Structure formats: structure tokens, C-alpha cells
Amino acid sequence: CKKEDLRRIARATGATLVSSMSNLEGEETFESSYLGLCDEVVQAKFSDDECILIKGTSKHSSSSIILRGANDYSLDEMER
Amino acid sequence: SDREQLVRAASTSLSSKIVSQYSSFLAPLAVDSVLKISDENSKNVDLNDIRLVKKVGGTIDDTEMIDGVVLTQTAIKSAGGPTRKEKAKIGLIQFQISPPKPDTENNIIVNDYRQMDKILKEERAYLLNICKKIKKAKCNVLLIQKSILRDAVNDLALHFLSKLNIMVVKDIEREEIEFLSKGLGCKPIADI
Amino acid sequence: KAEKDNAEVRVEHVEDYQAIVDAEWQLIFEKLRQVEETGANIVLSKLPIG
Amino acid sequence: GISVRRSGTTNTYEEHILQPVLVSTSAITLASECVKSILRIDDIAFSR
Amino acid sequence: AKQHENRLEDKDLSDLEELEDDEDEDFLEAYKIKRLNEIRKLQERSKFGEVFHINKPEYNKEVTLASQGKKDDGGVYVFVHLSLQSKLQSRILSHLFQSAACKFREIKFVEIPANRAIENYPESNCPTLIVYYRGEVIKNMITLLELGGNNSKMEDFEDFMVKVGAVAEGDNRLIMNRDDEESREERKLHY
Amino acid sequence: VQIFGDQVTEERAENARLSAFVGAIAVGDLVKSTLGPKGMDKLLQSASSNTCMVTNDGATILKSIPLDNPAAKVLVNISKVQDDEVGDGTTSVTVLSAELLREAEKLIDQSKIHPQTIIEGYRLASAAALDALTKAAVDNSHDKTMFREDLIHIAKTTLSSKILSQDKDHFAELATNAILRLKGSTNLEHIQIIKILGGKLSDSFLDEGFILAKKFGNNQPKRIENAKILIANTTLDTDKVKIFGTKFKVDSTAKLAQLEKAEREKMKNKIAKISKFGINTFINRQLIYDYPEQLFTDLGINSIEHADFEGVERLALVTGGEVVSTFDEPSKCKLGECDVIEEIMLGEQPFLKFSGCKAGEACTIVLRGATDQTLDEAERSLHDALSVLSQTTKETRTVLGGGCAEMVMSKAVDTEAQNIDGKKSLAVEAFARALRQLPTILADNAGFDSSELVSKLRSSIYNGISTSGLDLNNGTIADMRQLGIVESYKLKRAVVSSASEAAEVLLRVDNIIRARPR
Numbered sequence A: 001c002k003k004e005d006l007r008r009i010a011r012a013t014g015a016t017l018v019s020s021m022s023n024l025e026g027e028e029t030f031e032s033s034y035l036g037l038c039d040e041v042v043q044a045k046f047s048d049d050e051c052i053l054i055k056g057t058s059k060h061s062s063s064s065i066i067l068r069g070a071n072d073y074s075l076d077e078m079e080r
Numbered sequence B: 001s002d003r004e005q006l007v008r009a010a011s012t013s014l015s016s017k018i019v020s021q022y023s024s025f026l027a028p029l030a031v032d033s034v035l036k037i038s039d040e041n042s043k044n045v046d047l048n049d050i051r052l053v054k055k056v057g058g059t060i061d062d063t064e065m066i067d068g069v070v071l072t073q074t075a076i077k078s079a080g081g082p083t084r085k086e087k088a089k090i091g092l093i094q095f096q097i098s099p100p101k102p103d104t105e106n107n108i109i110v111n112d113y114r115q116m117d118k119i120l121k122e123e124r125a126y127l128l129n130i131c132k133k134i135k136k137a138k139c140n141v142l143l144i145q146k147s148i149l150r151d152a153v154n155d156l157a158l159h160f161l162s163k164l165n166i167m168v169v170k171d172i173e174r175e176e177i178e179f180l181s182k183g184l185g186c187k188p189i190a191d192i
Numbered sequence C: 001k002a003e004k005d006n007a008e009v010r011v012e013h014v015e016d017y018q019a020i021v022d023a024e025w026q027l028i029f030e031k032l033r034q035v036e037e038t039g040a041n042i043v044l045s046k047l048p049i050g
Numbered sequence D: 001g002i003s004v005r006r007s008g009t010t011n012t013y014e015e016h017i018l019q020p021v022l023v024s025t026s027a028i029t030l031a032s033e034c035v036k037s038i039l040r041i042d043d044i045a046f047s048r
Numbered sequence E: 001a002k003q004h005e006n007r008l009e010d011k012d013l014s015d016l017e018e019l020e021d022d023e024d025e026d027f028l029e030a031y032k033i034k035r036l037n038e039i040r041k042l043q044e045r046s047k048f049g050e051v052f053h054i055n056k057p058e059y060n061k062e063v064t065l066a067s068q069g070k071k072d073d074g075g076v077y078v079f080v081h082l083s084l085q086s087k088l089q090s091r092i093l094s095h096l097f098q099s100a101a102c103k104f105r106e107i108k109f110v111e112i113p114a115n116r117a118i119e120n121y122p123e124s125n126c127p128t129l130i131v132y133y134r135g136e137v138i139k140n141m142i143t144l145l146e147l148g149g150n151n152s153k154m155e156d157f158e159d160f161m162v163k164v165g166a167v168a169e170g171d172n173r174l175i176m177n178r179d180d181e182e183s184r185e186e187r188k189l190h191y
Numbered sequence F: 001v002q003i004f005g006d007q008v009t010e011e012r013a014e015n016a017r018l019s020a021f022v023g024a025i026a027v028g029d030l031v032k033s034t035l036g037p038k039g040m041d042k043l044l045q046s047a048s049s050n051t052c053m054v055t056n057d058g059a060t061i062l063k064s065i066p067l068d069n070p071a072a073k074v075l076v077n078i079s080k081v082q083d084d085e086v087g088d089g090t091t092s093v094t095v096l097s098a099e100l101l102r103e104a105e106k107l108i109d110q111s112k113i114h115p116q117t118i119i120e121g122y123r124l125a126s127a128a129a130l131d132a133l134t135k136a137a138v139d140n141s142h143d144k145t146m147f148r149e150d151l152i153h154i155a156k157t158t159l160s161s162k163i164l165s166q167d168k169d170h171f172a173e174l175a176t177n178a179i180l181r182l183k184g185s186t187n188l189e190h191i192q193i194i195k196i197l198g199g200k201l202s203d204s205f206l207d208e209g210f211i212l213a214k215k216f217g218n219n220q221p222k223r224i225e226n227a228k229i230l231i232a233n234t235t236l237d238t239d240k241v242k243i244f245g246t247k248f249k250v251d252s253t254a255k256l257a258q259l260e261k262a263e264r265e266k267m268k269n270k271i272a273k274i275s276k277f278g279i280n281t282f283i284n285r286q287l288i289y290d291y292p293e294q295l296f297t298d299l300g301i302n303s304i305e306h307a308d309f310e311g312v313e314r315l316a317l318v319t320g321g322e323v324v325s326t327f328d329e330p331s332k333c334k335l336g337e338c339d340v341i342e343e344i345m346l347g348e349q350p351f352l353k354f355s356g357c358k359a360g361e362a363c364t365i366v367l368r369g370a371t372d373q374t375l376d377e378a379e380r381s382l383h384d385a386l387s388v389l390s391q392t393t394k395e396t397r398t399v400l401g402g403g404c405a406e407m408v409m410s411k412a413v414d415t416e417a418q419n420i421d422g423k424k425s426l427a428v429e430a431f432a433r434a435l436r437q438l439p440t441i442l443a444d445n446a447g448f449d450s451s452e453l454v455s456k457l458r459s460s461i462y463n464g465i466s467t468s469g470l471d472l473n474n475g476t477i478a479d480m481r482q483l484g485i486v487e488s489y490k491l492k493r494a495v496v497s498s499a500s501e502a503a504e505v506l507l508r509v510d511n512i513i514r515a516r517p518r
């Protein structure tokens, strides 16, 4: 995964970005509040493109657009 | 001080540049910049106190005198805890926030598997008690120098400061320490 | 210790650091005193002299 | 003096065209010193 | 033509075992014995491994005699560092010497203060890097503006060692050739 | 036969000679225009990096210009060492050496005299010249007022040819006051030349105390009254401990945090050792790290870092104290005191100005100008003035200038020319005409008639008087004591001795062997 994506996952699903597991105390543990929430997660494959479809974020909504065309260079015009 | 003569003199002296027609608001900006430094002995006023920060974007009409000290560098955003601060206490760090080591190279040995638990706990403890002293002094904004020789920050130190809602920056020039200290009124810090 | 193999000396005390640095002078002078007692007026060697 | 907006001669103090005296002083002073150094040159010799 | 040579040339003793089930034993083990002998030579040549903080009387021996080595022209490269603690580039170059010393044990890494090296040396010219080999100076390098200056990295220093003939181009220890295990893992999956 | 091989130029007794003389003519005609007060400066263009150099000194002209002629290399080296010895008069050596060979070219061709016979005339002629130069001198230094006035006249005579010829009335005070402040110490390292762009040539002012181009720290104040100055050749940097070979073995990082605490406590105790004296400033040779810099804030101590090696002695002599590094015993090492430690700005760079010091054994010449080429000429001009006046302190005897030293020396040479039998007497007269050619050139550069003033000066001095000289402003003979033109005795002694040895080396040549270049 990349850095800029996981901030939007945590922002959408309601989780918080965890760079390391620690707290103000000396002990080391993990709390359930760091975890997000979503309704459904499904991995889909279409023409050698595996994509994990995360839908139904409870805290805040999100969106993505799956553009479809002839080839990658035609989709670059659609992406722009 | 005479706004009738100095403002008109500053506007009619540029006279050739692109901002000559924008001089309706920039000529007072030049007069108000120099009038803050005043002396009866007619000293040679140093222009190091007047820093011109170049940012690519926008238009020249948006140029205006900022009341406080504007910083050129951007934030780190490795943790990204705080977004907007209000009534913050600014501090200037000159040392480096890292696990404990001298400036020179060292050798650490491990003769037993139980020693690693003490090493991993004490390395973050040296970062923890620094954050406690930062919390005791209620310092909300920290400025860390470049420090090419020793690592300025790491993911561990950024995580403890992310909980306390403290922003951090890097890549500060050594010559600009006079401008930040004299401008913001914050003395530097080189020891915990 | 010019062509001799590199002896990795490791010490853990300050008082022994004075003993280990003087041991170099102690060894080389013991070799000179043993030659001095015999009265060798002309010393020769294929390898270099310190 | 000359005013560029009206394209003619007029009183510059009313039209607010002013400058420091040190600017014109340094111009006349440094110009005379540069001509003093140039006129003393006699030969142009190539060197290392 | 290169497809036959890549089976042996582009695989170390650890990577040559991949072709044990595919390629013939006599074709593979004949080259593994060759590569095994080369590994043994590097172990015998590993006479160094930490920065030799020396002093001048000794320079006339450590820096130069070593450069002769066995004198079988067993030459030895000797990287000298005229250190100056007041300069920022000198402390950076000292860190690169200890890092490279742990990896390249056959190459000698030498350090000495610049004030003690040469009578009345210019402080502006420090830090200085000299490379001896068989008694001759191969490179009299100037301050590290050529190697990025203040932003010098370990990758730039290892690249300089290849230019002077101290380390081979296709050496497995160099960071340019030492690809990460995660990098090679992705190549096998996408192959 | 060909023993020397391919690409080897050889010459034999008619190509060997007349190649050095034409080289002596070639090197002499260049520096002919630079001699005298009305001389024109020569501009040197470098072959690489488009570096230009405006300079009047004959040594610097010959330093930069490449000269493959071997005879010209002799004139290149003798101007170098003459600049090393006295600093002034290098052009007179090259002119007098070239004209001695120009005359000897005619004695070999016209009169047909052996070269060794010409040298034997120059040995007796040079001995008679130096004896007249010794007797023509005058004592000094018995009265400090006369010694003050003679240094002012020597500074005026030296700077009359340089770019400071118009403002020499003001620069003479600046040149002579700095030398008397040395208290007899003959050394040029105690004088700094700070380059400042702007102003005019006469804006150079005399500084009280010592000024240098440094800066305070980040948090230090602007003004401190009655500041005690200290100089540390110390390492307030990451000291390390000097038994290089110390490493830190660590079993657990608990004591490593306390080990780093001991490193900060080690340097804290070192800065605490500084505060036992109770100083107000701290000057270090090398860079000061931030952690020492923060410790001088609460203690009320100023900080100056990155001082040059010359700057340590230049500041310590003005302070009066000695350089201290151990800081152990506060009894010895009594420090000085300075009243005004406030910095000033001259141009775009602030400079730390001091005033009201114990001693002024080191000085600093502040210069103002338009172009850096003029400042480089200002540096070389006053360096020749301060070099001559500094050696005048140790060597007290002086001699009248204005061309009278050349003619009064030739008087005894012409007197001793008659009683010498043989063909070498013509060479003795050739030495006299060489001394006469210097004031002949002084009139040519000024644009006046040379034959009349040389004839009037020559006829005047033989009458019995020996104080007359050339006045190029009016173009007539005048009294040198009235105008106040005088030069040092060792300068003209070095010029005549160097010029005599210069002609001697090139006259003992018969063949040239130019090996192949690398």
C-alpha cells in the first residue's frame, strides 16, 4: 500500500493512522478504538486488474470511479 | 517619519518594474517595513530582518505584509495528527530527536534474549520522557534543524508527538536562526 | 609492530591502559638490553631496524 | 524637470517625482572613479 | 549467446543451487567449485574490517607498505582520510569509512587528523581522501562537492570505489547490485 | 652530427648572445611606462577563467605573463625576490638591468671589448657607487619628530606612482600611524586589508583599535560595556577525548542514556570552567556547536567563531592577553579590556569594531573604492608602502630620492673612471650612463624634455651642490629637501646590487641549450 491512500481509508472507514503501536505508558498494547468499520469488502478482478472494493463506510462516505475503455492510453484522456 | 514623502518617493523610485502599477499598496509596505527599525544615529539598517520569501503560485496582487514570521518549509505529514493550532507555544530545537547515541559511531552487543526487551523499551523511553518534558512545558510547536549527520526524527518519535497534537518541521537553514529567534521571540534550545 | 600481524587488543580499564602502552616500550627495551650485555659493537640485520 | 505621464516639462515636486541625494552622489562619484581607472590603462597583455 | 552465460555468471554460490534440479550436475558443480575457490580467496584477503586510527610515524608504513601487500602482485587499496572535526563533511566521511569497513574487509580504511598529517595544511581543503595502491597515489580527491557535498550518501561512496578499481562492477555487496529480497520476490511472481 | 636529438633548439655565440639582449630589451620596454609618478598602469588578461588584473608593480606584471625566453626568466626571478626582500623598487631593477645590458651590447659590438673585461669595470664601478651611496646617506631616529616626518615623505614617495598619488597626503598619515603603533615589531601579518565596495578613494579612514569581519551568535546582545576578551584555540566542538581508539561497549541502553548525559555534563563542566574567570566574550578558532552557544546566553558571554590563524595573533596582540586553552589556573594569563564592543556596518557586511584597547600592536586598514581592480591596486600599493616603512624601522639610514641618488652615485663612478687604465674604463663609463638613464626615463613618462633636464641636473651636481633633483610637476630643477622626497638606503642598495648581479649573469653566457618540453 501507498501512504496517500491509507489516510483516505482511515478517514473514510473511521480508523486512525497507526505508525507504531505504543501509548503514553511504558507498556505496549493495541486498543480496539484504532479499528475502522465498513459493511462489505470484496476483491474483484477485471482484465488482469485486481481491485479490493470497500463499500458501506459508516462514519463518512467515499467514492471511486472505474473507467473502462479500449486501452490504457485512451483511459489517460478519460482520466484527465 | 513622513507618509507623504516616503510613500510617494518609494512609488516614483521603482518606476520601471512590473509592480510599479501595483505600487499603490506595495509602497506603503516598503515604508512600514523600514519604519519599525528606527534610530537617531542614522545607522545602516540591515535588510536581514526583512526576508523576502518566494512562493510560486497565485498573483502579485495577493502580496501583503504578514504580521508574524512566515515559514517557507512545509510540514512533514508522516503522522498527520494535528490540523490547526490555536494559542500555541513555539520552541526552537537545535539538537536531534533520536534513540540514545553519541555523535560518533558505537557498538551495542546482545548476550541474552532478555536484553532486547530492555533495549526496545528504553529506546522509546528516551523519546517518551522528552515528550513528557515537552508536555510539562506545554510546548505545542517545535522547530528542528536540518541535522544531516544525525537523524532528526523517526516514526517512533513522530507517533508520541502525534498524540500530543504537536506539529514538527525540518530543513531549517542555519543562518535563519537569528531571524526566527529575534522575530518570534523564542530562544533556541540545544539541551533537554 | 610494523610488519607484524594486527593484534586486536581490547582493554576495559584505565589503569591497564597505562600498562599496555608501556608494555610496548618494555618489550623493545628488553631486546636492546640483552644485545647490550654481550657487547656487540656491530649489529646487522636483513630486515629493517627500528 | 520632465514628467513622463503628461509627456512634457513641469514642476516635479507637485507631481511627486523625488529621489535621494545619495543616489545621484554615488553616480557622479563612482563614474568619475571608473573613468580615472580606465584612462590609466595603456596596454592589453595576455597572461596566465 | 548470453543466455547460456547468465546461468553461471549471474548467480552466486547461494543462487547457483536454484539450478540443481534443472541443469546438469557436472555443468553446475564444475562452476560452483570455481566460485567456491573465489570465495575462499576473499576470506584470506580479509585482513581489515575497522578504521585504522593511525599517527604519522606509522604512515610511512601503514599507508605505503600496505599498499604493496605481498611485495604474485598482491596489491592492496588504502583509503586515507585527513579528518578535521570542525568541518561537517569530515564527520560524514568518517561514517562512510566505518560503514564500508564492515562490508569490504579486503580494502584498508585509514583515518588520521589533517592537522597532524601535513605541516600547516589548508583547513579549507579538508576533508581530503587519498587512495594508495602499490605505493602509488591513484586518486588525490578534493572536498566532497563532487560526491554531492553535504548530501553525500552511502550509494555515492560505493560508486566511487568502483571507479578507482577497488571493487568490481558486478559485486554482490554493492547496493546497486544488491537488490532487496522483496524486489526479487515481485519479479518471480510477475514473471 | 646531432647528439641533442630531435626538437632541441641550440645556439652558438651569435644566436645565443643577441637573443638574451633582445629579450632584455623586450622585458624592459614593457615596464618602461610603469616607472615614475606619471606612469600608466598595465592591464593583464588571463588566458583562462576571464580573470583580469590591474597592477602597476613590475613583479606582478612578470608573475602572470608567460615568458619562454630563458634570459627573461632571470628578470622574472629577480623581481620576485626583490618583492620578497623590500616589496618596492622591482621595476627599477628590471629597467636598470635591461639598460646595463643595452649599454654592454654596444661595448661588445662598437668598442670590441671582452665580456669579462666589462664585468671587471662593473665591479669597481659598483664599489664606487655603493661607497658614494653610503656617504650620501644621513642618520635618523635620534628625534622622533624627524623620524615621523621622514616616514611621511617615504610614504609620499612610494605612493606617488600607485593609484593613491592624488590622495597620498591623506594616506601618508594612515600609512605612518600604523607603523608607529607596531612598537618596533616588523611584521606585515598584523595588518588586515578588508575589501569594501562603495565610496571613493579618499574615504579610507584610520581605525582606533582593531576591526574584523566576524559576527556574534544567535542569541547574543548587541552592546556590552567594558567587555573582557578571551581567545581559545580550543575545541568547544565535539571534543572527543583524544585517545582515539575509544569506543563505547554497551550491554544495555539504560547506561547509554546516562553515558550521553555524561558527555553533556563533560562539556557543561568545561563551559563552567570558562565562567570561573568571568569573561564577557569568547573567541574560538574553529566552529562552535549550538550546545556551547546556548550556555553562553545565561552567563552573559559573547561568542565569536571561525577565526583565522592570522586573526588569532592579530586580535590577541591588540587585546594584550595570551591564548589560553587549559583554563586550569586563573592566577596567570591576565586578560585585557575593551570599552566599545559594538559592531558597525560598512556596505552590506557587518564588521566587529573594537575601540579603547590596551595596546595597538596590530592594525587594520579600511579601504573604500569603486572596482575590485582598484581595491587590488590599493592592496598592492599600501603593501609596498607598509613594507618599505616597516623595514625603515630596523634600517635607519635613508637617501634622497627624485633621481638625485642615481646621479650622485654616478659622480663618484665618473671620478674613478679617469684613473683606471685599460679598456675596462669604458665599461666603467657604461655603468654611469646606465645610472643616468633612470632619470632620463622619468622625464619621458612625464612628457617633458629629457635631454635638457638631465643635462641641467648633471651640470648642476658637478658644480659642488648635491641636493638638486627633478621636479616633474613644474618641469625644472628644484630642491628635494623642500618638496620632501626621500627613500630608504637599503632600497637603492638592493637595486644597484641586484642590477649589478643581473647584468653579470647574462653577460657570462655563450650558448643556449633548450631541451624538449614535456
Ligand SMILES: Nc1ncnc2c1ncn2[C@@H]1O[C@H](COP(=O)(O)OP(=O)(O)O)[C@@H](O)[C@H]1O
Residues within 6 Å of the ligand: F034, F035, F036, F037, F056, F057, F058, F088, F089, F090, F091, F092, F156, F157, F158, F160, F161, F401, F402, F403, F404, F442, F470, F471, F472, F485
Ligand atoms: N614625487 C616624486 N617626484 C620626483 N620623483 C619621484 C617622485 N616619486 C617617485 N619618484 C622617482 O621614481 C623612481 C621610482 O619610484 P618607485 O616608487 O620605485 O616606482 P616603482 O615602485 O614602480 O619602481 C624613484 O627613483 C624616484 O626618484
Ligand SMILES: [Mg+2]
Residues within 6 Å of the ligand: B013, B014, B015
Ligand atoms: Mg530606481
Ligand SMILES: [Mg+2]
Residues within 6 Å of the ligand: F088, F089, F157, F158, F159, F161, F384
Ligand atoms: Mg614604488
